């Protein structure tokens, strides 16, 4: 068992962690930092092509290779590790144990453009708008907009940009994504910008807008991705920024994330803390905890726990098919192994049909894979029907949790194993707690089973401009299979409290089994409703649905939408009305 | 020894020659195909993160990789292979012999973009143009132009563009190179498009013009990459089209090109043939012959034989040093390894100072190598210093070759080691025969010490709109070097014949022992002069310079132009007054 010591020597700390990285030899590794401040640059860093899920694959410049080990631990100490440019700050790959504690992490020029705006010409197609300074960098050139200009890399333009409450560092009341594309871009003097473009929703004056650059390069890297590792533990450990998601997990069993977090630094004038999730799970198994932890400001969800459908390309004999990903960012993911088991759906009935054990894999390229099964394939598989994997699913914990002011869902669960979410604190401006098998552009697999939602505080949920409710269960499968059929099954809602302005409160489409029971509603927050007279419940397409014992305080609000179908078994003891 | 045979049995030969290279075991390889026509898809081709010199890297679709041969050998009798989409068609890495022969290569639809252009509006900055058809493939959408709309893909813009003669095939008198951004492209119907822009340079009306797409993604691969290999053949192959080079030899040793070449398919309404090089040897060494071959219709030169500068970043210790590449597209390149002989150059003197022997290399990553020599470094190496690798250094010849129709120089030659240049047909919108030792932008290295350029044909030579020579001797040095120090040696230009318009026949910068002997220059080809008062001959800054025995036939030219210090060694001897 190797130890190895390091302090705040040099400037750039990269090439001392590299070296001392490369001459490791022993399976079992500790890395302690003695507590102070480390800066790592890319310049020097190692570079590697890696595959990243749900991010862009390519050459990395990476800080923290960790491949290999039988166990491997890191202790920051209560370090802060200051990141630069485009980087990878840690991966974990092919790892019996790891643990990574006390550290926080962030970056020295945020890759953000961060602007408060002065005014709006919608007649003429312009607005006016206050570059953040703070650590931002950004300049002109032209005619147009350049940031974060670190290392020679500038994106193309500001892409999907976001108006925030400058005061309370949260989405606006109403927000709407508006994708900016300007060519044209004058500098006003006194640091004011006057952007020319039309757009179909304009932000409104006197919020922040973040922006985050082009889609096809601002996935960079998450903040830790681990992939195909074991026993993994995250303590005391927050980030601030990363070029993509937060805390990433590929096909690794049994994870933690302890007293941690991704959010703003106190007192900072950043915006965004993750450019992307702050967790994401990918085809993981065993179990996942994440207990008494904190998430604010990402550019997209807290969590999202899934797996992966790949697509039937075709058939190559009777124990041997080849399967294709269907999102560009799923390309290069390690779908499956010996000894999976896996579900095969057929168009175009959604349900998991039947069960089949890998013998062995033929990875063709990073889009297709031919799978060889033990026992024979179904006579009925047909290109385009769907495999998801079986044995890759992870029962999934959340307690004792705040996820509050950022971008997009707060929980999002595509799990068919135990799903607890209990003791949390929830604000989003999208849906709080989400359900969305994808079949149509994401791929991502997902009929649950079993989820529990309970003892949970609600407070100003879903008010973004488009609609979304606190519980929201909506699959979205290809137009290649039925529409109607039962997905999710046996969802349990009980005894949270939501402050409410107007919004929906639980919309379920095909599940099977819902219960909503022992909440308390409270229509206690001062803000406009923005999809007028939208029910607290709605229910399409679903069977076996349960109102009971929970109490709405406030104005009145339209109670049940039901369609004829649901309305056949809604239990409902009129507790609302 | 295993041999495969083939035959033209799926319309996607792609998997059958996956499958099978992937069971090949034993070390001496050959493979024949029954003549026919072969059509090879990317979709379920192998794929490979590569480094490819004075291209791009990334993720490669590889249809024939051959890596780690001691004999691999293949045959096409005849056969043609039509590729398709982003693919790059041969790999031959670490081969201790290679031959390939009797077969041509092609795509089933080009990457470029070719149209008439029928109107020039210079008042509004617009063009009217009638793209060609043929098995061209573009679109409108978004408003511009989209090509080639192959598997998904296109460019953004048409990027560099030329203007050529529609019936010679040939680039324009007076062609210019120019930049194609235009946002805002309309059909005027009847096959007719309106391409919205300024241009500092249009093209004239009538002429075609060709367009390859956007600089960062146009280098895909060229047809043939070699690497690591020796003893490598080529003989009677044919390449119609790649998207990159034709011919790239990385670190290989004796090479020849024999009876094979890159132009256009006679009859088809092709205008290109490869988009970037015909031939280029990046630091190979043994010998290269090119013999009896043609190169036409590239977009790039038809030879470059030249190696890598690297700069000196770090000193390390008393032994190793840390290097840069100096230009982006030679990242990933492998600059020497165990047993290389390096010359080391100090500025700011631009000679080759020290020798040194490498003992081993530690690549830090695509840019940044450190090596370890066996002899202590010199006392004077500093940052910014320069390292040649000496050893990888090639004899080369050309003959009987003919090389003309194309965009560029026909000849550029960077060895140090001997240079014969004989009995070929060359035709040259740029200069005929280049030398640029370069260590300003493209870092390519070759103060060249015994080259003879004799018995050869120039008929219609630097047509360009920019000026340029039959012989143009230029190198092109950091001004953190001395700019009027000798750099090229030795070259002699004899008993050639050049059919000329007016355009110069030598310039010569910083040239030691120039012999320019028994030459023909007929002043027959009846095109406008360009470049007014322009000298047959020009030399500055120079020594010893002999003009001997040549013969100036019609109407008068301005003869020669010499500064006071090449004057003081410059015999003439008054033939051409
Ligand atoms: O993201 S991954 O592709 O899985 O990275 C792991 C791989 O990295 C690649 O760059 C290497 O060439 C492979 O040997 C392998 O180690
Ligand atoms: O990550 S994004 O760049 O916002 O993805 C864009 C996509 O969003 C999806 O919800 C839509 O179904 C897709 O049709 C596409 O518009
Ligand atoms: O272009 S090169 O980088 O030299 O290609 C050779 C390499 O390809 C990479 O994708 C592999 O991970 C390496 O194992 C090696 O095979
Ligand atoms: O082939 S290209 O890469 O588009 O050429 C661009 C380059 O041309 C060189 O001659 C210039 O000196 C460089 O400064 C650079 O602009
Ligand atoms: O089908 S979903 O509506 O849940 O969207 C899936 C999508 O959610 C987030 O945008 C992630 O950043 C993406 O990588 C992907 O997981
Ligand atoms: O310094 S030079 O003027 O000879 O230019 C070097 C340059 O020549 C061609 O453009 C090649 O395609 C490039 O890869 C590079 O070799
Ligand atoms: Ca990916
Ligand atoms: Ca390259
Ligand atoms: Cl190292
Ligand atoms: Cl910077
Ligand atoms: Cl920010
Ligand atoms: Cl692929
Ligand atoms: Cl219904
Ligand atoms: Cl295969
Ligand atoms: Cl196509
Ligand atoms: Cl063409
Ligand atoms: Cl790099």
């Not at 790959?93 to 005014?119: C, G, H, M, Q, R």
């Not at 006003?188 to 020319?196: F, Q, T, Y």
């Not at 179909?200 to 082009?214: A, E, M, W």
């Amino acid at each position: 068992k190797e130890v190895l010591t390091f302090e705040p020597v040099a400037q750039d700390m990269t090439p001392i962690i590299r070296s001392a990285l490369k001459n490791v030899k022993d399976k079992d590794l500790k890395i302690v930092f003695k507590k102070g401040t480390y800066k790592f640059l890319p310049e020097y860093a190692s570079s590697e092509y890696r595959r990243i899920t749900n991010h862009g694959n390519g050459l990395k410049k990476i800080a923290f290779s960790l491949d290999g080990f039988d166990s491997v631990e890191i202790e920051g100490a209560g370090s802060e590790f200051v990141f630069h440019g485009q980087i990878a700050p840690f991966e974990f790959y092919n790892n019996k144990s790891v643990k990574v504690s006390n550290i926080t992490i962030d970056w020295d020029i945020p890759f953000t453009f961060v602007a408060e705006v002065l005014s709006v010409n919608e007649k003429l197609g312009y607005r006016d708008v206050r570059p953040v300074k703070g650590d931002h960098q950004w300049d002109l050139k032209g005619g147009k907009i350049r940031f974060p200009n670190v290392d020679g890399f500038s994106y193309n333009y500001l892409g999907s940009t976001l108006a925030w409450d400058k005061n309370e560092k949260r989405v606006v009341h109403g927000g709407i994504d508006s994708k900016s594309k300007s060519d044209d871009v004058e500098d006003l003097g006194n640091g004011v910008l006057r952007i020319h473009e039309r757009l179909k929703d304009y932000p409104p004056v006197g919020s922040l807008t973040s922006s985050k650059g082009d889609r096809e390069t601002h996935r960079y890297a998450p903040a830790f991705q681990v992939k195909n590792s074991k026993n993994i533990v995250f303590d005391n450990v927050v980030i601030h920024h990363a070029l993509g998601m937060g805390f990433l997990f590929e096909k690794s069993e049994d994870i933690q994330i302890l007293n941690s977090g991704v959010y703003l630094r106190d007192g900072s004038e950043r915006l965004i803390s993750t450019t992307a999730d702050a967790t994401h799970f990918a085809n993981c198994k065993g179990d996942i905890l994440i207990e008494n932890s904190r998430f604010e400001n990402m550019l997209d969800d807290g969590a999202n726990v899934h797996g992966t459908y790949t697509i039937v390309d075709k058939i190559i004999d009777s124990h041997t098919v080849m399967v294709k990903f269907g999102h560009f960012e799923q390309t290069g993911f390690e779908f499956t192994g010996q000894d999976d088991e896996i579900w095969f759906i057929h168009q175009p009935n959604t349900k998991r049909e039947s069960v089949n054990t890998v013998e062995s894999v033929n990875v063709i390229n990073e889009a297709y894979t031919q799978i060889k099964f033990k026992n024979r394939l179904p006579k009925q598989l047909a290109k385009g029907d769907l495999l998801e994997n079986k044995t890759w699913n992870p029962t999934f914990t959340m307690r004792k949790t705040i996820i509050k002011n950022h971008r997009a869902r707060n929980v999002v669960l595509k799990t068919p194993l135990k799903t607890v979410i209990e003791e949390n604190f929830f604000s989003s401006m999208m849906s709080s707690i989400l359900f969305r098998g994808e079949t149509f552009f994401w791929y991502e697999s997902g009929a649950v089973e079993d989820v529990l939602i309970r003892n949970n505080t609600f407070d100003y949920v879903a008010y973004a401009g488009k609609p979304h409710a606190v519980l929201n269960i909506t699959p979205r499968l290809s137009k290649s299979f039925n529409q109607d059929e039962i997905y999710d099954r046996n969802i349990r809602f009980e005894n949270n409290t939501i402050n409410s302005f107007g919004n929906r409160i639980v919309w379920a489409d095909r599940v099977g089994g819902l219960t909503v029971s022992g909440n308390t509603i409270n229509r206690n927050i001062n803000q406009p409703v923005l999809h007028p007279d939208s029910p607290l419940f709605e229910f399409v397409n679903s069977e076996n649905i349960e109102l009971k014992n929970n109490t709405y305080n406030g104005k009145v609000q339209r109670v049940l939408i039901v369609d004829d179908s649901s309305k056949g078994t809604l239990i409902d003891d009129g507790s609302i009305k």
